[model samples]
Each structure stands twice: as C-alpha cells, then as structure tokens.
Target chain A: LSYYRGGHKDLESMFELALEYIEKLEEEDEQQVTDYENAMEEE
Target chain B: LSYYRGGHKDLESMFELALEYIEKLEEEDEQQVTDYENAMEEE
Candidate 1:
C-alpha cells in the first residue's frame, strides 16, 4: 500500500499501486539475482 | 542477507538464501495486494 491511511482514491488507483509494487519487486529480484550470479562467477 | 557473519557457506548457499528472501518478499507483496484489493472492493 502507499501508506496513506488507506492509500489511493479508488480501486483503479489501488490496482495501479499494486502493479507498481509488483514491478519494483521484480526489479529487486533481478538485481539480487545478478549480484548472486556475478558473485558466484567470481568465486 | 541472512543473519550470519555473511550467512551461507558459499556462493551457492548465499544464492539460495537470496531466493528465499525473494520468495518471502513476493509472498508479502501478494498479501498486501490482496488486502488492498479487498479493502477497495468493500469501499
């Protein structure tokens, strides 16, 4: 959630927020995977 | 990262831990999204 006591003004806004968070999660996983791969390769 | 002085015994172990954390993050997001959706639905 956006942490606005309830966040968003409507369902559409909340849905968009969820998608934004999902995208961020994907980016985080991708970065961590890349880090792990490179770290393993260097070992 | 885990909680050890680096956690894991090697790159492989570390990578697995990362995956575990990633999975946890995904679960958390899913839960949050569910909450947001249901809340919005009722609103």
Candidate 2:
C-alpha cells in the first residue's frame, strides 16, 4: 500500500514538472506522496 | 521510456484525484505519460 506513497514520492516531482510547464501553479505542486497513500488506502 | 506513460496511464487518474480534491484546479489535470517519459529520458 504505502510502497507507492513512499515510492510515489518520486512521482511528486514528475507531476510538478508537467504542471509547472503548463503554469497555473501558485495553486499547485507537491503531494505525489499524498496521492500515493490515498491510492494505497484505496487499494 | 514511455512504458510508464503507456503504463503510467493509471497514475494519471491517481494524480488527478489528488489535485481535484484540492481544487484551485479548473486549471489542472492529466499527463503522467509525459512525466514518465521525461523521467525515462532522465534515466
């Protein structure tokens, strides 16, 4: 479950980069770990 | 490289859920595939 959050931590930066390029940040960024854990919980 | 985007498709929704719940969106969504490749490229 947590393997992804703990593991998904890496995706945070991935998500961040994509969003940043598109802009609309300031209201965005950081939390792939949160998403990962939520999914882990969902699993 | 794209194995994750192609494969990473699942995470797209995963990442989507997190941002949606947070809102500020209306300006957010999708693209894990690109991230996956970029990382793939970085690797």
Candidate 3:
C-alpha cells in the first residue's frame, strides 16, 4: 500500500485540521455566555 | 494532538479503503472490453 501512503497522510492531516477548527468553534461557543456585573453610580 | 489520534487513524483507514475500491473499479473497467473469438462447428 505504499502507493496510498501519501494519500493516507493527507487524509489524516485533513481530519486533524477539521478537528482543530471544530474545537476552536466549540471553545468560542463556550465562552459566549458570561455573568454580567454592573455597578450603579449614586448621585 | 493526542486527542485526535484515533480520529486520524480512522481517517487513514477510510482513505485506504477508498483507494482499494477505486483500484478495483479501474481494474474491472480495464477488463470490460475484450476480443471475442468464435468457432463454428459443421455437421
């Protein structure tokens, strides 16, 4: 299967890239909602 | 990324399988058209 070695490597790299992107997206989503604290000024 | 190791292995295996199928198809197509020889028997 030497002929397919390069192809396998390419496929593996593509999958790794895809997973990286997916994890980044999930991380962004996880950081979306946060507790908001507001301080009111007294006159 | 160790986290993606399994996914990478799976992807590589899948690519190998696909290449195998493609090679098989090509071989089948190559064998499709052939020279036909016929012999007539006389009584």
Write down the TM-score of every candidate: 0.30, 0.23, 0.21
Candidate 2 residue runs with Cα over 4 Å from true position: A19-43, B1-43
Per-candidate DockQ values are 0.05, 0.05, 0.01
lDDT of 3 by residue, A1-43 (tens): 2234344335435545664343333222222211000111111
Error of 3 at B2 (Å): 22
Q: What is the lDDT of candidate 2?
A: 0.41
Off by over 4 Å in 1: A1-43, B1-20
Candidate 1 residue lDDT tens string, B1-43: 2232133234335445574455455444344444434544665
TM-score of chain B of 1: 0.50
Q: Indicate the residue-level lDDT of A40 in model 2.
A: 40
- Could you give candidate 2's per-residue lDDT for residues B1-43 as a string of tens digits? 3354344445446555673343333123234423533553565
Candidate 3's error at B24, in angstroms?
30
Between candidates 2 and 3, the one scoring higher on TM-score is: 2
lDDT per model vs. reference: 0.43, 0.41, 0.30
What's model 1's lDDT at B23? 49
- Model 1 TM: 0.30
